[PDB]
Design a protein around this ligand. Structure first.
Ligand code: 402
Ligand code: SF4
Ligand code: SF4
Ligand code: SF4
Ligand code: SF4
Ligand code: FES
Ligand SMILES: [Mg+2]
Length: 579
């Protein structure tokens, strides 16, 4: 093929779109609705408009290159068309970037600036109440910002295959939302927030908990605990122009103290707790044979997927609470026993890469004696904004350490945020528990990686067992619908709703398509976690000295006694009722 782009001749045999061929040859072409190798097929934004000689204006994002094509990407006719489309989008967009939560990284704003587009009539709604949906515990919608680009809809389909995010006809007008415009929580939605990640603007956001936190911080009698998820220390640095894959663990501990938090702990400690219970439970299920398989229960997105699509598997879920919930349980019980604080005055806050974590924390039964396990959950984005609002020079901060009591963690807990992380961490303890030894080789590389469905055969106590790691909610459906579950007897299965693991969560920092092309965001973030595991002395959850002291002095033996009573949570399919 011979391609002419802006007077430059190209000789290629590649079969691809004009947009991507231009991107591969450093030729600038704008784009909006195009994401994850798909565009808005029904109402194309036409921001990727280029001029093909002999044909006219075409959309470069979905037009294959052909031999003899003469393309102009920066002609006048092209730029006026693109400027016209952006202007029309501004006519339905509340253009007030000042208080907006996408101010520092909004794809639309940089398109408005690039083409210097102005609205024919400034969209200024008198009352955003009808445009805004804040009924969910995880998601919020602001349709004053929605461009109707369909990226959220496509993302939902690709990532979860639930199609919970739909195009809707709201009284003659086209909008996006849940089925029948219901609250997302009341539908088959997983609350994974992958639709947020795909949104170029502030139309989709997480359900804010920042008022919960700030009100608790300012309350004199409240002792506010904060504990961040594995993925946060590998991600939040992106929002401070520090690049990708930068371990900023120490900076976060310091920033949290300057924010006024009363105690700095870590969810990775709770991750070690989850492994303690789960690995013990796995050994229990082996000696009992059943119920197999055992599924992980730490991902609330997967829990909702099970509840909404596979309720017969609810009993097969691990009884062990998620690292977030199992931490919060101990924060209201164990922590006061070693501090003297009044449990009612304890306020536990977590920092999560996940929007579904907010729903899990607000589950009615996720409490004890009137005390919530987790009082508030803020996303990686929310913490970052909280830091910038306090004008904390994050990139200039010294590394400080967390408080050890519930802040120490092994390398096993560190890799939780990556796909296959929980599986590998659980095997490190389950093997040592069953064989009653301290095994040297603990690296399970075969369950790592970005493959959708990963299986492995493991040898536990002179017996072989089949494990599986499900990477992404869509791959759960594939694993079940295709009958892969029945090819062999699986004993232990990890499931994560977000592909790549929690590092690709819905509460994670946004990454513009032009950095996604150059950076493998899922591997680069996960690398930080794996590097920590490699450099740590303790790489097994049961070697967590702070955790061992907690169990020895308070809980006793894992999987039984008081631990089984308050650190566990079982999901049950609804009792029979009719209708
Ligand atoms: N609870 C919990 Fe988890 C832990 O530890 C986080 O905290 Fe995850 C992360 N990062 C999230 O959100 S949840 C699913 N298990 C894998 S990692
Ligand atoms: S979504 Fe983007 S363009 Fe719209 S107001 Fe917010 S920052 Fe500005
Ligand atoms: S909510 Fe966001 S991703 Fe979905 S159509 Fe609107 S602007 Fe596009
Ligand atoms: S939270 Fe997940 S399941 Fe729900 S609409 Fe968004 S992408 Fe779909
Ligand atoms: S994989 Fe992690 S971030 Fe994604 S829904 Fe599950 S718990 Fe939340
Ligand atoms: S980016 Fe090509 S039509 Fe929208
Ligand atoms: Mg205070």
């Amino acid at each position: 093929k011979t391609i002419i782009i802006n007077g430059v001749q190209f000789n290629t045999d590649e079969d691809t779109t004009i947009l991507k061929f231009a991107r591969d040859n450093n030729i600038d072409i704008s784009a909006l609705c195009f994401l994850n190798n798909c565009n808005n097929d029904i109402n194309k934004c036409e921001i990727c408009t280029v001029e093909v000689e002999g044909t006219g204006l075409v959309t470069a994002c979905d037009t294959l290159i052909e031999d003899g094509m003469i393309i102009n990407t920066n002609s006048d006719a092209v730029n006026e068309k693109i400027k016209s489309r952006i202007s029309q989008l501004l006519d339905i967009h509340e253009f007030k970037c000042g208080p907006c939560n996408r101010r520092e990284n909004c794809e639309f704003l940089k398109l408005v600036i690039k083409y210097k587009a102005r609205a024919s009539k400034p969209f200024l709604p008198k009352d955003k109440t009808e445009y805004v949906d804040e009924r969910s515990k995880s998601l919020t919608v602001d349709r004053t910002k929605c461009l109707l680009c369909g990226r959220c809809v496509n993302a939902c389909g690709k990532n979860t295959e639930t199609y919970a995010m739909k195009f809707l006809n709201k009284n003659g007008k086209t909008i996006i939302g849940a089925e029948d415009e219901k609250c997302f929580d009341d539908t088959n939605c997983l609350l994974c927030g992958q639709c947020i990640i795909a949104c170029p603007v502030a139309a989709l956001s997480e359900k804010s908990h920042m008022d919960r936190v700030k009100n608790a911080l300012n309350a004199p009698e409240k002792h506010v605990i904060v504990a961040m998820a594995p993925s946060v220390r590998a991600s939040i640095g992106e929002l401070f122009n520090m690049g990708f894959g930068v371990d900023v663990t120490g900076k976060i501990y310091t920033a949290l103290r300057q924010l006024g938090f009363d105690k700095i702990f870590d969810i990775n400690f709770g991750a070690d707790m989850t492994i303690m219970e789960q690995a013990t439970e796995l050994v229990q299920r082996i000696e009992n044979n059943g119920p197999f398989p055992m599924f992980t229960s730490c991902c609330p997105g997967w829990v909702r997927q099970a509840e909404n699509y596979y309720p017969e598997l609810l009993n097969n879920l691990s009884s062990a609470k998620s690292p977030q919930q199992i931490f919060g349980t101990a924060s209201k019980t164990y922590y006061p026993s070693i501090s003297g604080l009044d449990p009612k005055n304890v306020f536990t806050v977590t920092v999560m890469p996940c929007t579904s974590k907010k729903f899990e924390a607000d589950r009615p039964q996720m409490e004890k004696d009137g005390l919530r396990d987790i009082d508030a959950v803020i996303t990686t984005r929310e913490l970052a904004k909280m830091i910038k609002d306090a004008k904390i020079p994050f990139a200039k901060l010294e590394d400080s350490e967390a408080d050890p009591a519930m802040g120490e963690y092994s390398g096993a807990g560190a890799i939780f945020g990556a796909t296959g992380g929980v599986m590998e961490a659980a095997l490190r303890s389950a093997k040592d528990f069953a064989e009653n030894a301290e095994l040297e080789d603990i690296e399970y590389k075969q369950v790592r990686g970005l493959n959708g469905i990963k299986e492995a055969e493991v040898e536990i106590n002179n017996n072989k067992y089949n494990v599986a790691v499900i990477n992404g909610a869509s791959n759960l459906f594939k694993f079940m619908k295709s009958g892969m579950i029945n090819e062999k007897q699986y004993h232990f299965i990890e499931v994560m709703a977000c592909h790549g693991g929690c590092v690709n969560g819905g509460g994670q920092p946004h990454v513009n398509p032009k950095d996604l092309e150059k950076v493998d965001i899922k591997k680069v973030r996960a690398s930080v976690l794996y590097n920590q595991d490699e450099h740590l002395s303790k790489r097994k959850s049961h070697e967590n000295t702070a955790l061992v002291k907690m169990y020895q002095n308070y809980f006793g033996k894992p999987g039984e006694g008081r631990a089984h009573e308050i650190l566990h949570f079982k999901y049950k399919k609804s009792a029979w009722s009719h209708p």
